[PDB]
């Protein structure tokens, strides 16, 4: 159920994978 919520952040979490 959490992994499903993480997606909520993933909306901006990807921003982490941006830098590189």
Curated annotation (Swiss-Prot):
Taxonomically, which superkingdom?
A: Viruses
Name by which UniProt lists this protein: Hemagglutinin HA2 chain
User: What organism does this protein naturally occur in?
Assistant: Influenza A virus (strain A/Swine/Hong Kong/126/1982 H3N2)
List the lineage, top down: Viruses, Riboviria, Orthornavirae, Negarnaviricota, Polyploviricotina
Q: Which stretch of the full sequence is covered here?
A: 330 to 349 of 550
